[PDB]
Paper text:
Diffraction‐quality crystals of RA‐treated VmFbpA were obtained with a reservoir composition of 1 M (NH4)2HPO4 and 0.1 M imidazole‐HCl (pH 8.0). However, in the crystal structure, only a partial electron density of RA was observed at the Fe3+‐binding site. The RPC results indicated that the binding with VmFbpA was a degradation product of RA, DSS. Therefore, despite RA and VmFbpA being used for co‐crystallization, only the degradation product of RA was observed. Compared with Fe3+‐bound VmFbpA, DSS‐bound VmFbpA underwent a 2.1° rotation in its N‐lobe; however, compared with apo VmFbpA, the protein did not undergo any significant conformational changes. In the ligand binding region, DSS bound to VmFbpA through hydrophobic interactions and hydrogen bonds. Gln58, Asn138, and Asn193 directly interacted with DSS through hydrogen bonding, including the O10 of DSS–Nε2 of Gln58, O of H2O (443)–Oε1 of Gln58, O of H2O (443)–O10 of DSS, O13 of DSS–Nδ2 of Asn138, and O13 of DSS–Nδ2 of Asn193. Interestingly, Arg199 did not directly interact with DSS, but instead, interacted with one hydroxyl group (O14) of DSS through a H2O (444). O of H2O (444) formed hydrogen bonds with both Nη2 of Arg199 and O14 of DSS, thereby stabilizing the binding of DSS to VmFbpA. When DSS binds, DSS sterically clashes with the Asn193 in the apo conformation, forcing it into a new conformation.
Vibrio bacteria require iron for growth and survival. They utilize a ferric ion‐binding protein (FbpA) to bind and transport Fe3+ into the cell. Most gram‐negative bacteria contain the highly conserved FbpA protein, which is considered bacterial transferrin and binds to free Fe3+. Therefore, FbpA can bind Fe3+ in the periplasm of gram‐negative bacteria and transport it intracellularly through a transmembrane channel while consuming ATP during transport (Lu et al. 2019). FbpA from Vibrio metschnikovii (Vm) is a potential target for inhibiting its growth.
Author numbering: 1 to 309
Write the structure that this text describes.
Amino acid sequence: QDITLYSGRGETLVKPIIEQFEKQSGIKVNVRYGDTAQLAVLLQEEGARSPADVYWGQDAGAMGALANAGLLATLPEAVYKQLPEIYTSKTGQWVAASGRSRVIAYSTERASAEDIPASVFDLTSEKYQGRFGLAPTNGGFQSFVTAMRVQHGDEKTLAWLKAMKANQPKIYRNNTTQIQAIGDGEIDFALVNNYYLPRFVAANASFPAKQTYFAEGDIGNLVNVAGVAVLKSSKKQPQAIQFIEYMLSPAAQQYFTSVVGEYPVTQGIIPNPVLGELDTLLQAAPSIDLDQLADLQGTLKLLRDAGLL
Ligand SMILES: O=C(O)[C@H](O)Cc1ccc(O)c(O)c1
């Protein structure tokens, strides 16, 4: 037996996972690698003619476009019903294999957890002027802004963006350079995806940055996801589902958190010490329909209007 996977996830991440799945299941996985968003475009072009059985992406916006297009199979309840609601389609059209959340990183030399305000909205204050770094070209930042729009509307969101721009940010290419800049003393705070700082702490246990959450439910704690789904057009849904269940298995989940530095979606995983307990993330996370992150173009418009792009 074989299935076809369209992977928005990189081969160096995916390959060991699919190889162990193949070894255990006897099912071969033929993978087309690509950009998360561009593979969702391809799937919409292929429609019912797609050869794909499984789609695995690393941004909820693209998955949402597939869900809205009617291209995803409803998963068995046995796959999704036990997962936290931040990690599943309500109607069972996809599940998170791992959590890719927004956090706030801070200098351990020049700041502390006490400096972190209740809301991401509070970073426009003078207390933070010139002390934070933004990466407005980062996909994680952008989907976070889309989530802020969904939760709070454009006017609040644009006001925040402008106030953040008026607060003298330093502008960086990506999360790695933002975190390095904390180490280097250029900035004391950065809005980042959760899985970069683990990489620094693994290469150097005493890297002088930690990361943490805003208050419970704040949009700054958004949990994006590396979502996986079965195509409605698949004629091999049992095999596709076995693949998904493999990725939710303890060995795969432990790998995602220890090696990839993303949050697990299940209990019983030894936590990455940089991330801490899954229970804390569940308390921190905002309630957001991730399928609503599909509106990237509206977000890029607001960022252009704020002068951040
Ligand atoms: O494929 C990748 O680049 C990474 O696994 C995921 C990633 C991390 C941080 C980002 O800002 C991003 O856009 C993607």
